Design a protein around this ligand. Sequence first.
Ligand code: WVE
Lengths: 233, 9
Amino acid sequence: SLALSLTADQMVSALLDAEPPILYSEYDPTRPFSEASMMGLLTNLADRELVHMINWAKRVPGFVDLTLHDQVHLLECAWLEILMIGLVWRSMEHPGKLLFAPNLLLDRNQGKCVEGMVEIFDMLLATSSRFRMMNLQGEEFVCLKSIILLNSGVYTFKDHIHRVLDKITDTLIHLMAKAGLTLQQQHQRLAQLLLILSHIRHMSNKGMEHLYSMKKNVVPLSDLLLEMLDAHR
Amino acid sequence: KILHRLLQD
Ligand SMILES: NS(=O)(=O)c1ccc2c(c1)[C@@H]1CCC[C@@H]1[C@H](c1ccc(O)cc1Cl)N2
């Protein structure tokens, strides 16, 4: 529908305007974190982020054109990849740290507070390092996030989704053309960016196994997180 | 599904 019509510059504006807000952690606990308390904060935060993500997806040109069945499928497939690329983007300006929220900025060693989390932290930090090395721009980031949403479940059911993916590719190349990158540099950078999505898929699968491992059952997960987690079993 | 609700809401 609407989405294929758009200008590259328009597509970027539609996607910048759709960006969900940055949410805050609960202030209490406001201490050195325990396993149970750290798990509590992250569960609460992820659950509120998920509600904003669902509403962001509806503002992604082309997504509302899909049937409810297909929107559900894409979101069940992509939700943790989307949380993770958001986390990685927010964490750009804090090398060696993860900005879960402005009042929840965690170092590698705080990763150890939960068992099996430091492995995923390290992968997330590595992705933040890579985005910085590439000088990832906000306009590219919003393109990558929409590609994850439309791409991650497309194989697991298509023509329309592939046409919108082609449009977001056009938009990324458009953006790199305007920064004055040569044709060679544009296709090189387009490749480097899309190869990161393979690493983000890997981190999502590791994080998903981590979330299944809880139930442990220290902290109950929200009804929404459990719904999304159970779409991956 | 809560996901169905929020996608319609
Ligand atoms: N502490 S837990 O209870 O073990 C728990 C709860 C929720 C999540 C995780 C773990 C995994 C582990 C790392 C982060 C990841 C994921 C997440 C991603 C982005 C974000 O902004 C917030 C979150 Cl929470 N969700």
